[PDB]
Design a protein around this ligand. Structure first.
Ligand code: A1CG4
Ligand code: GNP
Ligand code: MG
Ligand code: MG
Length: 168
């Protein structure tokens, strides 16, 4: 069965775990879920083909050891997540993309820009800002709510379709 190794990255508190848990377990994150780094797995059907998603929900310390670089190099595609009410999380996106490009030694890595928490009303990053940044990188922008499930499948499946083609 075809396996896709997806990696979810972004600032503290943006909803990396919530997006992953919603995709895999069909509900929202809570006070009992893992806050150490962990991986999830689920067999799904995308465009009529069965495949297995292996999702790395990142956590822990920021560090640039050879081991950490090499480990991240193994991810096949990245969701770069910010929260639409957290401008600093959005301004950090360039940092995550820079590290992905550095370890993959390539500008052509499957990636999706995810603006999470779209259910909130108090938005401080507007859609045009996020679209502009996504267009500057040549990556899709998908607005999500891990709480209501809006956009969640589209975000992960878009990343899969990018990897699937990139492998062909
Ligand atoms: C989980 C750890 N984490 C991470 N924080 C940061 O930066 C946090 C901020 C705020 C402080 C100063 N620093 C710089 C900037 F200002 C933003 N960068 C991270 C990062 F670049 C990666 C990464 C991604 C893709 C890759 F190819 C590689 S390769 C490699 N060696 C990586 C590393 N490390 C890495 C990862 C990883 F690996 F999990 F995906 C996690 C990162 C937490 C630390 C506390 N955090 C926070 O938001 O505090 C406010 C977030
Ligand atoms: N309103 C709203 N809150 C969300 C959403 N996703 C996550 N949150 C909230 O944001 C906080 C962090 O969510 P979590 O998924 O743990 O974020 P994380 O990016 O995994 N944080 P960490 O880097 O510490 O592991 C929690 O209070 C959670 O309820 C969302 O779509 N909508
Ligand atoms: Mg945290
Ligand atoms: Mg988390």
């Amino acid at each position: 069965m075809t396996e896709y190794k997806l990696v979810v990255v972004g600032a503290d508190g943006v909803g990396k775990s919530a997006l992953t848990i919603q995709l895999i377990q069909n509900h929202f994150v809570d006070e009992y879920d893992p806050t150490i780094e962990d991986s999830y797995r689920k067999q799904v059907v995308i465009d009529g083909e069965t495949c297995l998603l292996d999702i790395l929900d990142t956590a822990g310390q920021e560090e640039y050891s050879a081991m950490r670089d090499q480990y991240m190099r193994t991810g096949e595609g990245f969701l770069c997540v910010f929260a639409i009410n957290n401008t600093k999380s959005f301004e950090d996106i360039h940092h995550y993309r820079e590290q992905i490009k550095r370890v993959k030694d390539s500008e052509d890595v499957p990636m999706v820009l995810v603006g999470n928490k779209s259910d909130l009303p108090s938005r401080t990053v507007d859609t045009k800002q996020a679209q502009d940044l996504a267009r500057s990188y040549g990556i899709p922008f998908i607005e999500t709510s891990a709480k209501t499930r809006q956009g969640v499948d589209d975000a992960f499946y878009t990343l899969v379709r990018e990897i699937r083609k990139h492998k062909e």
